[PDB]
Design a protein around this ligand. Structure first.
Ligand SMILES: *[C@@H]1O[C@H](CO)[C@@H](O[C@@H]2O[C@H](CO)[C@@H](O[C@@H]3O[C@H](CO)[C@@H](O)[C@H](O)[C@@H]3O)[C@H](O)[C@H]2NC(C)=O)[C@H](O)[C@H]1NC(C)=O
Ligand SMILES: *[C@@H]1O[C@H](CO)[C@@H](O[C@@H]2O[C@H](CO)[C@@H](O)[C@H](O)[C@H]2NC(C)=O)[C@H](O)[C@H]1NC(C)=O
Ligand SMILES: *[C@@H]1O[C@H](CO)[C@@H](O[C@@H]2O[C@H](CO)[C@@H](O)[C@H](O)[C@H]2NC(C)=O)[C@H](O)[C@H]1NC(C)=O
Ligand SMILES: CCCCC/C=C\C/C=C\CCCCCCCC(=O)O
Ligand SMILES: CCCCC/C=C\C/C=C\CCCCCCCC(=O)O
Ligand SMILES: *[C@@H]1O[C@H](CO)[C@@H](O)[C@H](O)[C@H]1NC(C)=O
Ligand SMILES: *[C@@H]1O[C@H](CO)[C@@H](O)[C@H](O)[C@H]1NC(C)=O
Ligand SMILES: *[C@@H]1O[C@H](CO)[C@@H](O)[C@H](O)[C@H]1NC(C)=O
Ligand SMILES: *[C@@H]1O[C@H](CO)[C@@H](O)[C@H](O)[C@H]1NC(C)=O
Ligand SMILES: *[C@@H]1O[C@H](CO)[C@@H](O)[C@H](O)[C@H]1NC(C)=O
Ligand SMILES: *[C@@H]1O[C@H](CO)[C@@H](O)[C@H](O)[C@H]1NC(C)=O
Ligand SMILES: *[C@@H]1O[C@H](CO)[C@@H](O)[C@H](O)[C@H]1NC(C)=O
Lengths: 330, 292, 410, 98, 49, 49
């Protein structure tokens, strides 16, 4: 079993340009009256990026329609133990993957009140810096439904389709028939070995952590670029207002305004290229699902090493996680 | 100096941090600095009558002040140690250093080193270990006998007599000050400052820096007692640039029967370095990293 | 006026596409004041206001910490000529508070103002006084009061030369230049002022010193009719718990968890004060973070307060262009925070009702518990808005159940 | 974006050089024009980087389009979901604006 | 488009009280210069008799 | 690009810090070195992206 993670979604962030640049100061807003078109362009670009991302996610998850599956039994279907990939709305292996990845929880229901009540993260820096992280398009109970339907899409129950896929690669009926129990136990050990695969030294878990760290790094750059002085006497407009005179105040506030606008433009460009890369990776994930999961691929190396037999897909923090069961002589 | 114990770290003034690690530039000692070790001894007393003063060459040597220095006080306390003038194992007590800091140095009438000119900052501990004197006066040598105004001068020292001024009836507020007044005359004193010290055997850290705001005195007694972090307790109005300092040799006049063992204090120079200070939840620095 | 008007103004168009737009948030106003000021002692300005001021090379320094002074009296006494400031303004000094105030003053003729400019090559910046620009500073030249306690000296004098002679013949000349904010070595020749214009001084330097011959020359300018003085002031901000304030205390117990304006022992700003567990050193009154922002405060009532910046409620606007119906989303905010607290928003928003969804409180969406497969206005977390008179809150659900019988080309 | 970035003042008294030259002295004229020059040069560098990224993406997508043509248009595809939904019979290509 | 002039009798000794950062009584109770428009402050001597 | 961006002046009197320290006073030295610092930091950020 080889593990592959393909990203499909990045975090959707919208920035309030006035609150980010000026932090609710009247003098800064008066100076930013001449830069309103750039703020409007920043909001429009970020809204377009998030809209295209939502459309890509909807197109990826629109594979439930015009697609029929069959009900499966409990954790033992035939002699194959499938309780790890089956819901009791997430599978135990999905829960195990989610608990070993450190994600700062974005409160979508009442996170603002939780960060207001909190005393001694970036999610609480959202409302003090001026950016908002949008909730994802689908609740996880829909992603779990999609993955469960893909598990169902393997009349012709799971052990019979497994033996058909073994018969297709070059093993006769007799060799499969006399060793059904050995095949079942070897499949069970292969499935049980997935517990130790959620480790940094496997590549796919490292890629999951890289995606989470990339989202956190984008938020951290957006939060920590507000502390740049940009050559002014201080990075805070309150210090400039409390330390300087009206003709000299506008120079420093304009320096802060220009620096923060340029930083917002750089952030917008980074978000655009990240969203395009995530959309292309989501197309790659859909192709990988349609080839490895819904059928059997005869091309070597695409669905893992060895000879591909069956692939299982589960949800990930920002994409899809694949479990490619393969054939290897020993 | 062990930076992993945050030895000799002066705490930032006016603010504190909790559960975060920062890199800071200030005045910190170098990691693995041996420093200079100074020992204060007991005077000669053959019979249980006093005699001469047993000192070292600390008064003759003049050290550049540079950015300041930090003093580790009483780290060898609660330990069996030898009296310096003899070989007698005794429990080590804590002794406070006495300093003389100035901006110009020369020679006496003998030609020996010393002789701080014009206004001189004196940091004389008194109260038998329970008072600190800060004086800013013009130092004028007295003539006659072994005082530095007559041509047989050897060294100047500060003496204390524990059966006279360390008694339980009371503590002499002017013991080391009157001992110092026998060698030099204090004239045109800008200020005299007094600080109370509580008597205990705990190890202490003392620091002293200088900038445009004056001479800043730091001590671990204020704030992080039972620790090593040093907090500001005094800002002396000494605005002329201090260039030199001298450790005054302090020899105690004690009898043969009532001798005592005194700790050795260490002085480490401060440098403009960068340090990674680790602030705990209670705010005190427990470990640090010297990036150089 | 309302939501979807900010949307129209931000897009600068009367027609926009149907969708969910994140409009700008609201303006936060302070609902109280948190003043905590001590009864400080008057600063000692008697050395400045009584006695003869010294010369420029023997300047007097006054450092003020933890004291209150009267700026109007000092400004009324002195007739102020031109001033130059770099990191501060005199109105900012008269307005706010600061950790320390360092003043250097001397007797200085008004005709030599240009010799104190930062790029000067004259002898004043070389041997007498050099201004330091590490802190925000002002350079003030003023005329002393006539009949008050300040008395005129005999004349104005300054060091014209200060050099070292060496080379075993006293023939090598090396000038000794001062540092910014420091005194001169040649100021000990005549600390009370030079007597003649061509006064020549000589002194042998010791071995612990440079070791050469100190040579110092001093010039003398005749004293004017009125005493003219120079002032080099400086301020510091984050170096002390107590502050110096030029010339009432409230309590935060009745207003916790709300945006107030605070002035705590000279530190001023705006923020939200909540009760918190005591962290950091108590004798340092303020707790900071890695970015040098106030995150905690030890009050005089023995309560540690966690300080948070004032926050604005996020806003999102659902818009449907065909039916001209709009909705308002408060992102990740509970409805009790909309109703009870704040209650400062847009005009119609302040005035169907507030509904709590998985994405936050919404107004303008009527709950119908209807299910759709897809829609053009997703709200996030499998929620949707379906237009009808007004938009209705819906949800997205999945449905999961062929022998070839009839031809069909897709 | 390229056309509208010319209206940025970049901290100057105006975004127009003609308004700067008619309102100021040469030692300040040079400073304001240098402000405008630095802002426009930085914006041009950002535009150049964005164009490079977009053109590389378009080249990779053109290679993908050539692969899709070779797989679905000139021949029948046996791969599931690559060329349409369900099974694949035939495909037709036409030109698009880009 | 327009030109606005404010003039008043003013000694040249009190000239530094008209600087924008001043804390004196002239900037508080007499005249504070506004910087909302391109402005200039000119101190001059009137023609003699 | 990384090597050639070090020759940009970013509005300063020179692209060399040695020239700035040679030709200027400290209040203007700190103002003119800061433009070079900000420009080189922004260029490094663009290079990193
Ligand atoms: C030499 O021995 C003396 C013996 O008294 C040491 O003094 C004691 O040091 C301990 C250090 O933990 C002090 O305990 C602390 O007490 C405070 C206040 O009660 C408490 O809050 C702390 O949690 C801690 O328990 C103890 O009070 C102190 N006693 C006295 C009388 O000072 C001294 O530290 C030793 N010095 C050396 C260099 O070994
Ligand atoms: C002090 O800081 C440390 C690290 O910043 C905190 O430890 C974290 O605690 C949270 C909550 O229990 C965990 O989720 C993190 O994994 C911990 N991180 C590390 C590195 O240990 C600690 O809770 C803080 N202590 C306080 C605030 O009292
Ligand atoms: C600061 O000093 C000014 C001037 O000395 C004080 O103002 C005077 O106050 C007294 C008493 O109210 C009046 O009789 C004078 O007429 C005032 N003079 C002026 C010029 O206003 C002022 O009160 C002082 N500030 C404080 C807080 O005491
Ligand atoms: C006015 C002096 C004579 C100037 C003309 C002579 C030579 C030109 C060469 C160098 C001038 C350098 C000094 C510039 C003015 C210094 C002013 C000051 O130090 O405050
Ligand atoms: C000139 C008197 C100075 C006396 C020294 C004592 C304190 C000065 C400290 C702070 C106040 C700055 C005043 C700046 C000059 C006022 C100029 C003006 O208002 O136009
Ligand atoms: C299937 O595996 C689970 C643990 O992964 C185990 O608890 C269960 O007993 C197994 N089923 C059978 C029939 O052994
Ligand atoms: C410095 O302190 C640390 C922790 O207290 C200790 O492990 C280390 O050995 C010390 N250094 C030396 C040289 O002893
Ligand atoms: C020091 O002790 C004396 C005697 O009790 C007392 O009068 C004085 O106030 C103390 N000093 C301080 C700073 O508390
Ligand atoms: C410093 O002392 C020397 C001699 O001790 C004296 O000549 C000189 O005037 C003094 N300087 C002062 C008091 O500024
Ligand atoms: C001071 O004494 C030292 C040591 O004898 C000598 O080297 C030096 O020349 C003397 N200096 C003066 C000024 O007498
Ligand atoms: C604030 O918290 C402290 C410690 O938790 C507690 O002692 C105090 O009573 C609290 N005050 C209020 C008003 O809640
Ligand atoms: C809408 O109403 C139904 C039934 O009354 C209820 O189950 C559901 O929770 C409601 N939705 C919201 C968002 O309150």
């Amino acid at each position: 079993i080889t593990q592959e993670y393909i990203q499909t979604t990045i975090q959707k962030v919208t920035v309030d340009c006035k609150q980010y640049v000026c932090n609710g100061f009247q003098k800064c807003e008066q100076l930013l009256r001449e830069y309103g078109q750039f703020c409007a362009k920043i909001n429009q670009a970020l809204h377009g990026a998030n809209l295209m991302q939502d459309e890509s996610v909807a197109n990826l998850f629109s594979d439930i329609k015009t697609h029929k599956s069959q009900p499966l039994n409990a954790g033992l279907n035939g002699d194959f133990n499938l309780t790890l990939l089956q819901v009791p709305h997430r599978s135990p292996i999905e829960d195990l993957l989610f608990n070993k990845v450190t994600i700062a929880d974005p409160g979508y229901m009442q996170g603002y009140d939780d960060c207001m009540k909190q005393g001694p993260d970036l999610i609480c820096a959202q409302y003090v810096a001026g950016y908002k992280v949008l909730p994802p398009l689908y609740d996880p109970n829909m992603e779990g439904a999609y993955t469960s339907s893909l598990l169902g899409s393997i009349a012709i129950p799971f052990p019979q389709s497994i033996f058909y896929r073994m018969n297709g690669i070059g093993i006769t009926q007799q060799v499969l028939s006399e060793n059904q129990k050995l095949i079942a136990n070897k499949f069970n050990q292969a499935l049980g070995a997935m517990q130790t695969g959620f480790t940094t030294t496997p590549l796919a878990f490292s890629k999951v952590q890289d995606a989470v760290n990339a989202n956190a790094q984008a938020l951290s750059k957006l939060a920590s670029e507000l502390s740049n002085t940009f050559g002014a006497i201080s990075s805070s407009i309150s210090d400039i207002l409390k330390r300087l005179d009206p003709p000299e105040q506008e120079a420093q506030i304009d320096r802060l305004i220009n620096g923060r606008l340029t930083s917002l433009n750089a952030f917008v460009a980074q978000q655009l290229v990240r969203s395009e890369t995530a959309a292309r990776s989501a197309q790659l994930a859909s192709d990988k699902v349609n080839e490895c999961v819904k059928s059997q691929s005869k091309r070597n190396g695409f669905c893992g090493s060895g000879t591909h037999i069956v692939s299982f897909v589960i949800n990930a923090p920002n994409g899809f996680y694949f479990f490619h069961v393969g054939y290897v002589p020993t | 100096i062990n930076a992993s114990k945050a030895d000799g770290i002066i705490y930032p003034t006016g603010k504190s941090y909790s559960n975060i690690s920062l890199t800071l530039q200030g005045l910190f000692p170098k990691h693995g600095d041996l420093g200079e070790q100074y020992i204060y001894s007991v005077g000669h007393s053959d019979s249980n009558y006093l005699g001469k003063l047993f000192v070292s060459d600390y008064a003759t040597k003049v050290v550049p002040f540079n950015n300041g220095f930090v003093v580790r006080i009483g780290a060898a306390a609660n330990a069996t140690g030898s009296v310096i003038i003899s070989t007698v194992q005794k429990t080590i007590k804590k002794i406070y250093p006495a300093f003389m800091l100035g901006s110009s140095v020369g020679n006496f009438s003998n030609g020996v080193s010393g002789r701080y000119f014009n206004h001189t900052l004196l940091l004389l501990p008194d109260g038998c270990g329970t008072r600190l004197w800060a004086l800013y006066c013009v130092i004028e040598p007295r003539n006659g006998s072994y005082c530095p105004g007559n041509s047989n001068y050897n060294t100047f020292a500060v003496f204390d007599t524990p059966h006279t001024d360390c008694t339980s009836a009371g503590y002499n507020t002017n013991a080391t000050l009157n001992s110092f007044k026998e060698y030099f005359d204090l004239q045109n004193c800008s200020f005299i400052y007094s600080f109370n010290i509580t008597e205990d055997e705990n190890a202490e850290w003392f620091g002293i820096t200088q900038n445009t705001q004056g001479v800043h005195l730091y001590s671990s007694r204020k704030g992080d007692l039972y620790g090593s972090n040093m907090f500001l307790f005094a800002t002396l109005p000494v605005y002329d640039g201090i260039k030199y300092y001298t450790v005054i040799p302090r020899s105690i006049r004690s009898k043969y029967s009532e001798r005592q063992a005194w700790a050795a204090f260490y002085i480490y120079s401060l440098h403009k370095l960068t340090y990674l200070l680790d602030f705990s939840v209670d705010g005190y620095i427990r470990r640090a990293v010297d990036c150089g | 006026h309302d939501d979807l008007s900010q949307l129209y103004c931000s897009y600068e168009s009367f027609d926009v596409g149907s969708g969910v737009y994140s409009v700008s948030s609201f303006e936060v106003h302070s609902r109280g004041q948190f003043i905590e000021q001590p009864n400080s002692v008057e600063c000692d300005f008697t050395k400045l206001l009584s006695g003869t001021p010294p010369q420029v090379y023997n300047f007097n320094r006054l450092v003020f910490t933890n004291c209150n002074y009267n700026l109007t009296k000092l400004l009324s006494l002195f007739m102020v000529n031109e001033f130059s400031c770099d990191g501060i303004s005199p109105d900012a000094i008269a307005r706010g508070c600061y950790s320390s105030l360092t003043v250097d003053y001397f007797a200085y003729p008004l005709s030599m103002k240009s010799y104190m400019q930062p790029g000067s090559a004259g002898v004043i910046s070389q041997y007498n006084y050099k201004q330091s620009f590490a802190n925000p500073t002002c350079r003030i030249f003023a005329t002393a009061p006539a009949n008050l306690t300040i008395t005129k000296p005999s004349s104005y004098s300054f060091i014209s030369k200060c050099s070292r002679l060496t080379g075993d013949n006293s023939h090598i000349e090396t000038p000794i230049v001062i540092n910014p904010g420091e005194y001169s070595i040649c100021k000990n020749f005549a600390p009370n002022g030079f007597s003649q214009d061509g006064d020549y001084f000589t002194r042998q330097l010791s071995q612990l010193e440079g070791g050469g011959i100190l040579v110092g020359v001093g010039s003398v300018t005749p004293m004017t009719d009125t005493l003219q003085m120079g002032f080099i002031i400086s301020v510091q901000y984050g170096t002390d718990t107590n502050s110096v304030c030029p010339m009432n205390s409230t309590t935060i117990t009745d207003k916790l968890g709300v945006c107030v304006e605070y002035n705590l022992y000279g530190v001023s700003g705006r923020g939200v004060f909540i009760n918190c567990t005591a962290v950091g050193v108590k004798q340092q009154r303020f707790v900071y973070d890695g970015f040098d922002n106030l995150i905690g405060y030890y009050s005089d009532d023995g309560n540690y307060y966690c300080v948070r910046p004032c926050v604005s409620v996020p806003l999102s606007v659902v818009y449907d262009k065909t039916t001209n119906s709009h909705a308002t989303i408060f992102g990740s905010v509970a409805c009790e925070h909309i109703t009870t607290m704040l209650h400062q928003f847009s005009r119609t928003t302040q005035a169907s009702g507030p509904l709590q969804t998985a994405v936050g409180c919404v107004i303008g969406l009527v709950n119908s518990s209807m299910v759709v497969d897809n829609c053009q206005l997703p709200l996030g977390q499998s929620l949707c808005a379906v237009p009808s008179s007004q938009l209705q809150l819906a949800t997205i659900n999945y449905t999961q159940p062929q022998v070839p019988t009839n031809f069909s080309f897709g």
